[PDB]
Ligand binder design. Sequence first.
Ligand SMILES: Nc1ncnc2c1ncn2[C@@H]1O[C@H](COP(=O)(O)OP(=O)(O)O)[C@@H](O)[C@H]1O
Ligand SMILES: [Mg+2]
Length: 240
Amino acid sequence: TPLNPDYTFENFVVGPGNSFAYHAALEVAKHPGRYNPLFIYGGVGLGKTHLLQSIGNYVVQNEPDLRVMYITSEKFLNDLVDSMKEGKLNEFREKYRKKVDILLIDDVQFLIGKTGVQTELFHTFNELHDSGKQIVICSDREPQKLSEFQDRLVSRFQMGLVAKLEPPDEETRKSIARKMLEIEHGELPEEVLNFVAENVDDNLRRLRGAIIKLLVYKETTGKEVDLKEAILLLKDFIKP
Ligand SMILES: Nc1ncnc2c1ncn2[C@@H]1O[C@H](COP(=O)(O)OP(=O)(O)O)[C@@H](O)[C@H]1O
Ligand SMILES: [Mg+2]
């Protein structure tokens, strides 16, 4: 149960592009089991992971005694592979069903082609679901657009909530960048913050990247960040 201290509902700025996703997520965490399952989808750096673990953290705090499980489709892959090699299929099934009340799986696009794993995940889903265990799945693609995927699994993804994250607008981006700073206990000029939150618009992974890059500079160069200086430092965040 090692979740990220930052990935919480409170450090999530809401905006037209992520509002619905954020509420579904929050709602699911307030009533684990009521809406099974929750499948969040969106492109890179849009809050999937962050949102996914918030459900985790929120539940760890308001439902102290409740087995919460976060995981990457990839680990679900790597763990199975071993289950087969090491020979203990049980240990695996005990770990991902018998001993979980809430199961959060991130980046499911990793299972494309991996029909092997796809099959085992399928049942894990059904057993957890038939016993009211909350399931949440994050994907960089929507159920349909998920290539090389077992229809039965895919149709399992839809029988619940389906929310889509979309990149935020400039106004909302600046707010995210500001809340990003708090979390890093940093600080920047009200003209640098702007320039960054206005030109590092690919995704939020890079937005934070830049905001940290600068902080690292303000660490070494004890002086400070000058708008011009920032632009030199952030070359690879405007045209990668
Ligand atoms: N709505 C948001 N409000 C504030 N910060 C956000 C928001 N969404 C994402 N972030 C920031 O971006 C990072 C998470 O990006 P992430 O969710 O992992 O991208 P992805 O969903 O593509 O994996 C976090 O560290 C967080 O600080
Ligand atoms: Mg992710």
